[PDB]
């Protein structure tokens, strides 16, 4: 069935959606990230990272501190429920995670951790 979604990050520092719905009948969910545009990873790299709303800021801040060589994400970050690699234009990456990780009474957010991008590149991921 449909327990997957295609997300795009472009040269204008924007995702093509700020809301993803995960049907409760899904046991696992897949996000397929692509990067239309022409800019390379260093100027406009994008990733897809999922965490609780409360942990978002910490994940973003520590991600920047980790550096481009670590795809701007702190290694073994226990706050990260799902993540794709950092990609440049023309590249792609997919990630699958267990829906059981979406704890009851928690609001999940998806965002890009490349320095400054989360200002525009964010969205809600809700289970229903
Ligand atoms: Cu980005």
Curated annotation (Swiss-Prot):
Gene Ontology cellular component terms for the protein in this record: periplasmic space; plasma membrane
CDD domains linked to this entry: Azurin
Subcellular locations according to the entry: Periplasm
Pfam families hit by this protein: Copper-bind (PF00127)
Source species, domain of life: Bacteria
Primary localization: periplasm
Residues of the Plastocyanin-like domain: 1-128
InterPro entries: Azurin (IPR014068), BlueCu_1 (IPR000923), BlueCu_1_BS (IPR028871), Cu-binding_ET (IPR050845), Cupredoxin (IPR008972)
Keyword list, A-Z: Copper, Disulfide bond, Electron transport, Metal-binding, Periplasm, Signal, Transport
One Gene Ontology MF term: copper ion binding
Binding site for Cu cation: 46, 112, 117, 121
Disulfide partners: 3-26
Purpose: Transfers electrons from cytochrome c551 to cytochrome oxidase.
Protein name (Swiss-Prot/TrEMBL): Azurin
UniProt gene name: azu
């Amino acid at each position: 069935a449909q327990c997957s979604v295609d997300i795009q990050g472009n040269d204008q520092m924007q995702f093509n959606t700020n809301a993803i719905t995960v049907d409760k009948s899904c046991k696992q969910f897949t996000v397929n990230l692509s990067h239309p545009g022409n800019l390379p990873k260093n100027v406009m790299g994008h990733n897809w990272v999922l965490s609780t709303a409360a942990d978002m800021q910490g994940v973003v801040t520590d991600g920047m501190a980790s550096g481009l060589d670590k795809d701007y994400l702190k290694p073994d970050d226990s706050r990260v429920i799902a993540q794709t690699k950092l990609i440049g234009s023309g590249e792609k990456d997919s990630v699958t995670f267990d829906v059981s990780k979406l704890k009851e009474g928690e609001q999940y957010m998806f965002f890009c951790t490349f320095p400054g991008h989360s200002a525009l590149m964010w969205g809600h991921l809700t289970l229903k």
